[PDB]
Amino acid sequence: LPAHGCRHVAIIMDGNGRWAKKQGKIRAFGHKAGAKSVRRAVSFAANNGIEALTLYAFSMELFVWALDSEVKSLHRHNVRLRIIGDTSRFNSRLQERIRKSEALTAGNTGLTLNIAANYGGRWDIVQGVRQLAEKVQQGNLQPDQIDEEMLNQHVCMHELAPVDLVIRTGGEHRISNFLLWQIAYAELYFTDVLWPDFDEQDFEGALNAFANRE
Amino acid sequence: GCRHVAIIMDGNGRWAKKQGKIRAFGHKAGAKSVRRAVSFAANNGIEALTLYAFSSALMELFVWALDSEVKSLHRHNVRLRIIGDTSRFNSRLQERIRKSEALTAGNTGLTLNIAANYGGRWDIVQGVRQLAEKVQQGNLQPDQIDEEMLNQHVCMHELAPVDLVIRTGGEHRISNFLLWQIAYAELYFTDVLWPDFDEQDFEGALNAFAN
Numbered sequence: 445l446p447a448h449g450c451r452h453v454a455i456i457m458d459g460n461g462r463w464a465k466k467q468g469k470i471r472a473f474g475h476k477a478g479a480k481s482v483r484r485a486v487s488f489a490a491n492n493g494i495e496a497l498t499l500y501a502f503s504m505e506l507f508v509w510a511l512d513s514e515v516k517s518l519h520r521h522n523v524r525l526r527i528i529g530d531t532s533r534f535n536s537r538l539q540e541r542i543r544k545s546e547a548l549t550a551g552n553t554g555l556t557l558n559i560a561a562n563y564g565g566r567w568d569i570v571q572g573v574r575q576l577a578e579k580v581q582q583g584n585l586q587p588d589q590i591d592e593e594m595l596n597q598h599v600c601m602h603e604l605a606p607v608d609l610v611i612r613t614g615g616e617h618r619i620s621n622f623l624l625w626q627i628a629y630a631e632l633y634f635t636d637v638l639w640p641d642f643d644e645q646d647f648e649g650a651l652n653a654f655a656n657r658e
Numbered sequence: 659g660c661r662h663v664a665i666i667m668d669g670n671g672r673w674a675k676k677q678g679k680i681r682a683f684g685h686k687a688g689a690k691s692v693r694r695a696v697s698f699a700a701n702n703g704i705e706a707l708t709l710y711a712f713s714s715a716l717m718e719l720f721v722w723a724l725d726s727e728v729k730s731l732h733r734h735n736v737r738l739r740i741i742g743d744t745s746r747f748n749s750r751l752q753e754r755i756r757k758s759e760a761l762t763a764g765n766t767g768l769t770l771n772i773a774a775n776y777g778g779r780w781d782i783v784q785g786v787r788q789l790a791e792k793v794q795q796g797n798l799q800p801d802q803i804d805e806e807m808l809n810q811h812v813c814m815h816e817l818a819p820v821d822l823v824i825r826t827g828g829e830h831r832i833s834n835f836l837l838w839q840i841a842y843a844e845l846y847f848t849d850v851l852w853p854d855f856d857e858q859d860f861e862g863a864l865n866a867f868a869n
Binding site: 586621627 | 783791833
């Protein structure tokens, strides 16, 4: 419905390290500047009527640390938080804290923010495939009954609007095993801007490219 | 060191319009461009070239094309493969494809993969069905299914991984061409219309990969 026409933007955040190196600073400084850039992106997306924003840090501690304080801020901004990726092996305490963060913001009506954690597009497809395999095994599913629509219902974020636009900052032109199944029809937008420097005008530029290309 | 290039060929219609000609003229020009790209890939050591024409007469034209060009590809040591769901094409066309693939299957020069009614999601689904058959047979447990295994059941698993995807025509989308296969490929988008895409354009894409 929004003027730019897209409902779900996914971003491959790259450039944090190079940004810090340009400044003569260690990588942790760029990762912090990157976290600030994430907050700015989240506010921009919400203020621009985007339904969902999915972020992939292209490459655990910061994640672990930032969880509590960051989640409280997202909650106060009416953002619904969801973690996508393979957390099945994360220790039980972390898995519980993640669940608590999702549970807390589950009823929020603002932006739905998906954060990739140990995520891979091929893994995503495989986990869905294993779910269908189980049905087949139980005798409840004929292999010929498996079609794209069914597999689609088992890949991450199938309940949200399809990803409309994928932005990759940092200058590389590859998906790097982020979303695969989900980006079959998405506009792909590449910018040389390093993630910490990616701001509202840069995001507006990607949305405008989408609008003019759609 | 780019071993497998995939191309979404788009721009034939727009090209013909700009030249003040009918769609057919653009397609004829587009076909010459295919000939040129195939030669460039073979001449520059590219191991595999996968072509997707972005969109009963068409089918018959495919039969005709196969009948007239396969022998030459065969003499050039090119292996021809059609990727996509050809299951519902007419029986005669399915047989012509099978015979052309069979004839050139052992060739070791360039492998040329031509998409025909292909979709990246369909490709993944067909591999999933194969694994499903094995599960319903008892020869495979759902939790034995991993990336490596699914990878062995999607199109072109026997070839070098796709290293570079080029899309001509100006659009910046994959449009359900390869998905599983391009997880790590360089994506190169050019506004150049397919009929105009030449060796300089192709080299430009290879340079993007090289960088």
